[PDB]
Amino acid sequence: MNNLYRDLAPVTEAAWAEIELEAARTFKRHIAGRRVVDVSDPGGPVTAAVSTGRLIDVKAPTNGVIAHLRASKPLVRLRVPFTLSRNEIDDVERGSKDSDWEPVKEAAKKLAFVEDRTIFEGYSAASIEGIRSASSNPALTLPEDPREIPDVISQALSELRLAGVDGPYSVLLSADVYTKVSETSDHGYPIREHLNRLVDGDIIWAPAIDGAFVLTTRGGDFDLQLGTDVAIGYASHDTDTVRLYLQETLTFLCYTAEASVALSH
Amino acid sequence: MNNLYRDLAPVTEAAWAEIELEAARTFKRHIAGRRVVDVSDPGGPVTAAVSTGRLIDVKAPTNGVIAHLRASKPLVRLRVPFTLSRNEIDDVERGSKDSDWEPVKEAAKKLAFVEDRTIFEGYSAASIEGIRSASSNPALTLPEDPREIPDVISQALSELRLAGVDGPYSVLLSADVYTKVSETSDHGYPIREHLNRLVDGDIIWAPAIDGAFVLTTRGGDFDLQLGTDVAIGYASHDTDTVRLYLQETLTFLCYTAEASVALSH
Amino acid sequence: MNNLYRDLAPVTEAAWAEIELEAARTFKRHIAGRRVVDVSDPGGPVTAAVSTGRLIDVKAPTNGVIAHLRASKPLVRLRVPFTLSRNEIDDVERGSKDSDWEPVKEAAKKLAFVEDRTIFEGYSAASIEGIRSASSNPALTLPEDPREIPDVISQALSELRLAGVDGPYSVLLSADVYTKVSETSDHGYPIREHLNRLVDGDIIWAPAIDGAFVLTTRGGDFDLQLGTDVAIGYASHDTDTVRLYLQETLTFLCYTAEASVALSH
């Protein structure tokens, strides 16, 4: 019996399949960082830190001895608990196809948002500097007029060219910026079909981020280290509800400070 | 994991066998309708209604269109919860053969009584008209003298003959009437051995019904549609007790209004 | 002999083939909902209701019993009668290729219109809430200027994105709106070639609907349950005319309230 204790949950195998389907769908839908960073195989429940290869100076234990600590980054475990109604769980076996999986969707969306805020915007208590703060290229400003956004994206591509970084390049846009370039048009084409012609990679919807990011997807610059991937576990239950959670263990490392350009408002 | 959640119940496999034995025995003992009606195979947890073949007039959605709804009868799920002592459940594995399965017996008896009241006497909220109300033959009256009951049963058999219905005929007697014909005698034989000689079918003990019924068991007149048959499920438990329930999904349909005669007091 | 009684109709096999060809062509031409909803296999003439998996509270038949009705949606049978001239039926065997099948076309068009009004706009006597009323996304308004319609369709696509729903997306346009975007142009292209570039699914002509619909065609959101598909039956005939009808039995269910956006004027 794993530490998730799913066998103790008053949930049927049909309801489990529906919950796992909904969570996987929502997480894959709302996650943007995994499309552009390198994602490693999960290390297991035992892995607790990632080796940086660096040495930290420490006071010698005795004279004539030289001492260093090995430098590492800790993995952070993120848990999002949600509550399900047992009536909706019972309905699944009776053939219901409209069960309320809305809390599962909220939990998967919140987990995806936490992972993408962590990669792009950082999480300092976990010692994760984000792609924005680690970026060495100058930061550009997005204008209010959506028809001007293709100019600044070409400016960011020029900053990436000057840094000696080659493509393919992808653009990650905030939900607000993605809506503005999608609902605004010039020459009979959305301002976001203009962006699709500037780059050889994708234009990514990133509802978690601020502003925008232009970065290369050549590989070897951004590293998402997974301890365990997203899993559903069982917490508690009463007559009416079941208490579950979503969970993942990970840390993020970035090696190239000039592989990305960050944009803001 | 089924929606019964029997794996979460603090009940051993020996105690489960004893409980299932007791419930099956009591239900088979106290059920009378299944001996005379046609009982179908269970349709499963998904089946929710039985097609009648009829059409209901509905207002047309537009001019030059004719509309009908299909007519159907809903299946009703009946649940009888009961409570067991965990000490008696523990005693079974230690070799005890006198465990208190009295609540299981009460629950099985109540479920059997609900099923037989539903078939014979109806359940109007479920849209089940009983065999008594759907009967088109005239209703006869049982007398107080038990030695006169064989005369009225022969009168009912004559009413079934006049209706053009052929046997084999069975008589279902109320618990009171079954006790009166069993504990009263003429010519050195119980008044109920007299009834056994009037009919080519059985005399049925029916502790749920009022009065008596005389009906044919030729087939194709009374139909018990089973969604799921009697199953034991697990609700809850604490340190002292386990909370279980008996459950079944079904509806009843009758096609011949002259296949039965109902008797009362 | 089926209940359609086509063997009693004074119609030849050549005329039958021509009538069946014309009806199939017109129905496939004027039907839009079947292009975007899931259409099941016909259940047969016996199927009368579709199980929802839900339970309805009903008053207990006796104390210590818990009762629920199974919840289901009835199938509605729609019949459109039409009249054919027997002279035109006779002409077919003599080699005529211009027989008046106009009533067959009117009947097929009316049946298709009833099916699409039912899916999108509902039919409350059949207990069918339409895609418009079941939609949980906000409703958008179509402007009078046809050159502005691509902006509102991109707004609806943004509402579907915010709901967490992924494509492929299709747009269904009213006959009026489809004519307006087809007969109006900007940059040398119809305003409807602009719409074809916004979406990865189709732009559907829907002559039955009001306004427009933007919805996902990923599957598992809209369900058209067929009892019997469109069939031609024989009603009556005299010296001059034959009386036929078109017929189908179905109901519609929708499971995702955020899978569609409805537009109006």
Side-chain angles (χ1 to χ4, degrees):
Chain A
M1 161 163 275
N2 195 2
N3 264 357
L4 289 180
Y5 304 129
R6 280 169 43 127
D7 285 8
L8 305 185
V11 181
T12 60
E13 183 174 0
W16 270 129
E18 302 214 350
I19 289 151
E20 272 282 3
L21 196 71
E22 209 70 76
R25 195 158 69 172
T26 300
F27 193 81
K28 183 196 184 50
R29 172 66 171 148
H30 283 78
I31 204 70
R34 294 200 188 206
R35 293 180 64 183
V36 300
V37 315
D38 292 330
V39 182
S40 68
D41 313 311
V46 188
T47 181
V50 181
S51 177
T52 68
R54 302 302 184 100
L55 299 180
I56 299 149
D57 299 359
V58 58
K59 188 175 182 181
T62 190
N63 294 300
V65 178
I66 296 163
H68 303 91
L69 290 174
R70 295 300 301 267
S72 66
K73 277 174 57 165
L75 266 81
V76 62
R77 185 190 87 175
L78 301 161
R79 182 183 278 197
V80 186
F82 61 97
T83 303
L84 286 189
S85 178
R86 290 184 67 180
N87 282 336
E88 266 77 7
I89 302 180
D90 295 346
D91 283 333
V92 180
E93 179 175 319
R94 287 190 294 269
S96 162
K97 294 162 199 185
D98 57 309
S99 283
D100 187 25
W101 304 138
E102 204 276 342
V104 180
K105 297 171 192 187
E106 288 181 353
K109 186 179 176 182
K110 204 172 292 175
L111 195 64
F113 274 33
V114 167
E115 194 202 279
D116 280 344
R117 290 303 290 185
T118 301
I119 291 169
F120 289 102
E121 318 292 356
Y123 181 22
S124 60
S127 303
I128 299 170
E129 183 177 43
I131 291 178
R132 189 164 299 248
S133 298
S135 189
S136 67
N137 294 324
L140 293 174
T141 303
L142 286 156
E144 290 77 0
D145 181 16
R147 301 196 172 59
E148 290 189 326
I149 291 174
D151 291 324
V152 197
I153 294 300
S154 79
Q155 291 176 27
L157 289 168
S158 82
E159 312 296 341
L160 281 178
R161 195 195 323 122
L162 192 138
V165 166
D166 187 38
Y169 310 110
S170 294
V171 189
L172 305 107
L173 303 177
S174 191
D176 198 67
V177 174
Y178 194 98
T179 298
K180 277 168 176 164
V181 304
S182 301
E183 293 177 9
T184 307
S185 174
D186 201 358
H187 313 92
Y189 298 110
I191 290 315
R192 196 194 62 191
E193 171 60 9
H194 296 62
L195 303 184
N196 278 112
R197 291 190 277 239
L198 297 182
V199 295
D200 45 358
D202 292 345
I203 310 301
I204 318 289
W205 180 57
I209 70 167
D210 307 327
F213 291 94
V214 185
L215 51 66
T216 180
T217 57
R218 65 176 173 185
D221 312 295
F222 318 102
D223 190 33
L224 181 70
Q225 291 286 311
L226 279 184
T228 72
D229 214 357
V230 185
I232 314 165
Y234 159 72
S236 177
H237 81 266
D238 52 3
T239 42
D240 275 327
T241 57
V242 180
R243 282 73 174 267
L244 310 170
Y245 56 79
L246 297 182
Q247 198 193 71
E248 64 174 0
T249 313
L250 49 84
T251 201
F252 180 70
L253 307 95
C254 59
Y255 313 126
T256 304
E258 71 266 350
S260 85
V261 183
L263 292 94
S264 67
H265 278 289
Chain B
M1 161 163 275
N2 195 2
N3 264 357
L4 289 180
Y5 304 129
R6 280 169 43 127
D7 285 8
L8 305 185
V11 181
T12 60
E13 183 174 0
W16 270 129
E18 302 214 350
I19 289 151
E20 272 282 3
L21 196 71
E22 209 70 76
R25 195 158 69 172
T26 300
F27 193 81
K28 183 196 184 50
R29 172 66 171 148
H30 283 78
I31 204 70
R34 294 200 188 206
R35 293 180 64 183
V36 300
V37 315
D38 292 330
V39 182
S40 68
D41 313 311
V46 188
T47 181
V50 181
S51 177
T52 68
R54 302 302 184 100
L55 299 180
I56 299 149
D57 299 359
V58 58
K59 188 175 182 181
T62 190
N63 294 300
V65 178
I66 296 163
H68 303 91
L69 290 174
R70 295 300 301 267
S72 66
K73 277 174 57 165
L75 266 81
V76 62
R77 185 190 87 175
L78 301 161
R79 182 183 278 197
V80 186
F82 61 97
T83 303
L84 286 189
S85 178
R86 290 184 67 180
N87 282 336
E88 266 77 7
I89 302 180
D90 295 346
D91 283 333
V92 180
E93 179 175 319
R94 287 190 294 269
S96 162
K97 294 162 199 185
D98 57 309
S99 283
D100 187 25
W101 304 138
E102 204 276 342
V104 180
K105 297 171 192 187
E106 288 181 353
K109 186 179 176 182
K110 204 172 292 175
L111 195 64
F113 274 33
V114 167
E115 194 202 279
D116 280 344
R117 290 303 290 185
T118 301
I119 291 169
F120 289 102
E121 318 292 356
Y123 181 22
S124 60
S127 303
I128 299 170
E129 183 177 43
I131 291 178
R132 189 164 299 248
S133 298
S135 189
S136 67
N137 294 324
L140 293 174
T141 303
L142 286 156
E144 290 77 0
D145 181 16
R147 301 196 172 59
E148 290 189 326
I149 291 174
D151 291 324
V152 197
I153 294 300
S154 79
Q155 291 176 27
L157 289 168
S158 82
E159 312 296 341
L160 281 178
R161 195 195 323 122
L162 192 138
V165 166
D166 187 38
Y169 310 110
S170 294
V171 189
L172 305 107
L173 303 177
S174 191
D176 198 67
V177 174
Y178 194 98
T179 298
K180 277 168 176 164
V181 304
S182 301
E183 293 177 9
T184 307
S185 174
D186 201 358
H187 313 92
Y189 298 110
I191 290 315
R192 196 194 62 191
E193 171 60 9
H194 296 62
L195 303 184
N196 278 112
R197 291 190 277 239
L198 297 182
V199 295
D200 45 358
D202 292 345
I203 310 301
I204 318 289
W205 180 57
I209 70 167
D210 307 327
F213 291 94
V214 185
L215 51 66
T216 180
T217 57
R218 65 176 173 185
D221 312 295
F222 318 102
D223 190 33
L224 181 70
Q225 291 286 311
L226 279 184
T228 72
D229 214 357
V230 185
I232 314 165
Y234 159 72
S236 177
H237 81 266
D238 52 3
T239 42
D240 275 327
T241 57
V242 180
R243 282 73 174 267
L244 310 170
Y245 56 79
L246 297 182
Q247 198 193 71
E248 64 174 0
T249 313
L250 49 84
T251 201
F252 180 70
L253 307 95
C254 59
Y255 313 126
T256 304
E258 71 266 350
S260 85
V261 183
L263 292 94
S264 67
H265 278 289
Chain C
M1 161 163 275
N2 195 2
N3 264 357
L4 289 180
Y5 304 129
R6 280 169 43 127
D7 285 8
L8 305 185
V11 181
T12 60
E13 183 174 0
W16 270 129
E18 302 214 350
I19 289 151
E20 272 282 3
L21 196 71
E22 209 70 76
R25 195 158 69 172
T26 300
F27 193 81
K28 183 196 184 50
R29 172 66 171 148
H30 282 78
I31 204 70
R34 294 200 188 206
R35 293 180 64 183
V36 300
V37 315
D38 292 330
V39 182
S40 68
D41 313 311
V46 188
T47 181
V50 181
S51 177
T52 68
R54 302 302 184 100
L55 299 180
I56 299 149
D57 299 359
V58 58
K59 188 175 182 181
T62 190
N63 294 300
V65 178
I66 296 163
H68 303 91
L69 290 174
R70 295 300 301 267
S72 66
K73 277 174 57 165
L75 266 81
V76 62
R77 185 190 87 175
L78 301 161
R79 182 183 278 196
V80 186
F82 61 97
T83 303
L84 286 189
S85 178
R86 290 184 67 179
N87 282 336
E88 266 77 7
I89 302 180
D90 295 346
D91 283 333
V92 180
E93 179 175 319
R94 288 190 294 269
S96 162
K97 294 162 199 185
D98 57 309
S99 283
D100 187 25
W101 304 138
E102 204 276 342
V104 180
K105 297 172 192 187
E106 288 181 353
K109 186 179 176 182
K110 204 173 292 175
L111 195 64
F113 274 33
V114 167
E115 194 202 279
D116 280 344
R117 290 303 290 185
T118 301
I119 291 169
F120 289 102
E121 318 292 356
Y123 181 22
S124 60
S127 303
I128 299 170
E129 183 177 43
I131 291 178
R132 189 164 299 248
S133 298
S135 189
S136 67
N137 294 324
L140 293 175
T141 303
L142 286 156
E144 290 77 0
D145 181 16
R147 301 196 172 59
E148 290 189 326
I149 291 174
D151 291 324
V152 197
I153 294 300
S154 78
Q155 291 176 27
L157 289 168
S158 82
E159 312 296 341
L160 281 178
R161 195 195 323 122
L162 192 138
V165 166
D166 187 38
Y169 310 110
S170 294
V171 189
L172 305 106
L173 303 177
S174 191
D176 198 67
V177 174
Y178 194 98
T179 298
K180 277 168 176 164
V181 304
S182 300
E183 293 177 9
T184 307
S185 174
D186 201 358
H187 313 92
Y189 298 110
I191 290 315
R192 196 194 62 191
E193 171 60 9
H194 296 62
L195 303 184
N196 278 112
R197 291 190 277 239
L198 298 182
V199 295
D200 45 358
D202 292 345
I203 310 301
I204 318 289
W205 180 57
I209 70 167
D210 307 327
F213 291 94
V214 185
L215 51 66
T216 180
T217 57
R218 65 176 173 185
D221 312 295
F222 318 102
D223 190 33
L224 181 70
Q225 291 286 311
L226 279 184
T228 72
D229 214 357
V230 185
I232 314 165
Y234 159 72
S236 177
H237 81 266
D238 52 3
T239 42
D240 275 327
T241 57
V242 180
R243 282 73 174 267
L244 310 170
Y245 56 79
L246 297 182
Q247 198 193 71
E248 64 174 0
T249 313
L250 49 84
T251 201
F252 180 70
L253 307 95
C254 59
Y255 313 126
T256 304
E258 70 266 350
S260 85
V261 183
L263 292 94
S264 67
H265 278 289

